[PDB]
Amino acid sequence: VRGMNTSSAMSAFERMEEKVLMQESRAQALGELAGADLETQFAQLEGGSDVD
């Protein structure tokens, strides 16, 4: 309940931080790829194709 440093609580904070940062890092890596026009073009093409 306290959230004070503990054998279980301490481990949980670090792991959660790692999960948050790793996901953010992946997103950061992803956004650069996302920024390029070709990636955007594929999504637009797919939507038209999907509707058909």
Partner: protein, 52 residues
């Protein structure tokens, strides 16, 4: 080396054509940003082709 440049020049023309298709698609889609990216891409390629 001359053949490689010619292939690169051919690739640039091919690349422009691929970009052109996206631009045509963009107009149908109505998204201004997709069209803009193709034009910028076309210009650098043209300069490279001229230099080549």
């Amino acid at each position: 080396a001359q053949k490689r440049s010619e292939k690169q020049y051919n690739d640039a023309q091919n690349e422009i054509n691929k970009w052109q298709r996206n631009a045509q698609l963009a107009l149908q889609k109505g998204d201004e940003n997709l069209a803009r990216q193709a034009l910028e891409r076309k210009k650098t390629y043209t300069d490279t082709s001229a230099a080549l």
